[PDB]
């Protein structure tokens, strides 16, 4: 570009879209579990992974992964969700916080307890 072209029309900056639109620039969001179910991974992965469709206070309905082994969730549960992708699951962009509102911490876990929300053993 020439100097005159730059003066007539400057440079253009393209805005970056957020990868967590449903949070709406908040660290976490509260939602009501609409449907808890299991899904299969995209190739080359095979499993039965636990996910829940949740309606958020932001007015959006999304899908959130349930981490750890063993969960007590069901329909009409109230959960807290944070950001975070699951990679091999198409369209799962959020995670459910363990042990926050109605979700419970994982059982018989003694390492990385702050994640999955397990208290200290006696």
């Amino acid at each position: 570009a020439t100097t005159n072209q730059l003066i007539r029309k400057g440079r253009t900056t393209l805005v970056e879209k957020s990868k967590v639109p449903a949070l709406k620039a908040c660290p976490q969001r509260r939602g009501v579990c609409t449907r808890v179910y299991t899904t299969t991974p995209k190739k080359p992965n095979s499993a039965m992974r636990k996910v829940c469709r949740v309606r958020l206070t932001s007015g959006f309905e999304v899908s959130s992964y349930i981490g750890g082994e063993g969960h007590n969730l069901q329909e009409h549960s109230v959960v807290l969700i944070r950001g975070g992708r699951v990679k091999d699951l198409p369209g799962v962009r959020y995670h459910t916080v363990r042990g926050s509102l109605d979700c419970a911490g994982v059982k018989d876990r003694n390492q990385s307890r702050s994640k999955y929300g397990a208290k200290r053993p006696k």
Binding site: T3, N4, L6, I7, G10
Partner: protein, 79 residues
């Protein structure tokens, strides 16, 4: 001791008033190239001596009307 400007008349239709175009040359803040800017000032000219195309000098004054706050000093060059 009074701020003054020199410009060229681009209108004399109004009664006792002229429109003089002031031109300045400044550097572009980012790209550095020297550019030219223009401003149009309404001025008071009591005796309608100024015409279209002359080069005049105008000094700041108290408001005379809604848009005029400058007054003619002299005609430097005539068309």
């Amino acid at each position: 001791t009074v701020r003054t400007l020199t410009g060229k008349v681009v209108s004399d239709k109004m009664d006792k008033s002229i429109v003089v175009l002031i031109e300045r040359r400044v550097q572009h803040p980012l790209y550095g190239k020297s550019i030219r800017r223009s401003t149009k000032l309404h001025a008071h000219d009591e005796n309608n001596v100024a015409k279209i195309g002359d080069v005049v000098t105008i000094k700041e004054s108290r408001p005379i009307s809604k848009t005029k706050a400058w007054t003619l000093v002299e005609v430097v060059e005539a068309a």
